[PDB]
mmCIF file of C-alpha atoms in Angstrom:
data_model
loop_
_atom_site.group_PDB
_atom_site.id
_atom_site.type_symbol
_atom_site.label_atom_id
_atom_site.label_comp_id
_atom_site.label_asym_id
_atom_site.label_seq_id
_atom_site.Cartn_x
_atom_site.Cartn_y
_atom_site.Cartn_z
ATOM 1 C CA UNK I 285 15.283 15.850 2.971
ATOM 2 C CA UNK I 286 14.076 12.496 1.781
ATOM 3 C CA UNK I 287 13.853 11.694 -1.710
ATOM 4 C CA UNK I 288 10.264 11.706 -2.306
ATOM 5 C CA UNK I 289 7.065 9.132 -1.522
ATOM 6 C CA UNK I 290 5.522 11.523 1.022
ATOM 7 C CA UNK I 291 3.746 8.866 3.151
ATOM 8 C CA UNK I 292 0.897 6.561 2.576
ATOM 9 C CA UNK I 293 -2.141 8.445 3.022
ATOM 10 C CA UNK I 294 -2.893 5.338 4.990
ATOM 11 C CA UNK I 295 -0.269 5.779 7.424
ATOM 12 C CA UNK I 296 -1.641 8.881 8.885
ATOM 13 C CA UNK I 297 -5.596 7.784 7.853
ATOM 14 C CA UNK I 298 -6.494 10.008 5.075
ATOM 15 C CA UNK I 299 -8.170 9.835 1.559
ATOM 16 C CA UNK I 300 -7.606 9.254 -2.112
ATOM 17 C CA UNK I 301 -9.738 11.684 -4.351
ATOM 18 C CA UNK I 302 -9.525 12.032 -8.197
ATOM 19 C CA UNK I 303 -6.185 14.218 -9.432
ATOM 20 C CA UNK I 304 -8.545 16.390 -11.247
ATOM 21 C CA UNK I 305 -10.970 16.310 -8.073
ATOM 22 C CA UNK I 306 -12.446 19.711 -7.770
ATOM 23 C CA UNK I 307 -13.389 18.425 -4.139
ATOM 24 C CA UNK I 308 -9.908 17.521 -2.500
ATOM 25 C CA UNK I 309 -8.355 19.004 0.477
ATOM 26 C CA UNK I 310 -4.212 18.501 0.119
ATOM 27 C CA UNK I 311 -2.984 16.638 2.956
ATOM 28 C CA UNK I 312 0.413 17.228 3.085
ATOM 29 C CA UNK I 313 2.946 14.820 4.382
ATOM 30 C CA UNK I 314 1.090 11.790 2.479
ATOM 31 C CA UNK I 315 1.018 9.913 -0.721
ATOM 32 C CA UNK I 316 -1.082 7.334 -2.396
ATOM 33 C CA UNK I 317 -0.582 4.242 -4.304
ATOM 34 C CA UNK I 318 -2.398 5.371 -7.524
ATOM 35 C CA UNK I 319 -0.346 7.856 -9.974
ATOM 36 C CA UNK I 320 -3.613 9.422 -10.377
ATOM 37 C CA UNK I 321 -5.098 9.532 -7.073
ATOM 38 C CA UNK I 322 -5.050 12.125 -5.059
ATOM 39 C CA UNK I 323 -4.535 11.714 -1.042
ATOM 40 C CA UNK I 324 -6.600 14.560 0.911
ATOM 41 C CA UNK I 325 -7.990 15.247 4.391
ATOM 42 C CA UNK I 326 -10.832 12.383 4.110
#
């Protein structure tokens, strides 16, 4: 089940929008390098 750090949102080519982005579409299966960024669609 893994232990966590989804997958860079690079690694599938995605996005990194504000945490508190009211404009961010979750892409699952993904994670970003900022503790405050967010890693959506694009």
């Amino acid at each position: 089940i893994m232990f966590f750090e989804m997958q860079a949102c690079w690694s599938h080519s995605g996005v990194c929008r504000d945490k508190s982005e009211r404009n961010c579409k979750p892409m699952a299966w993904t994670y970003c390098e900022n503790r405050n960024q967010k890693c959506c669609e694009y």
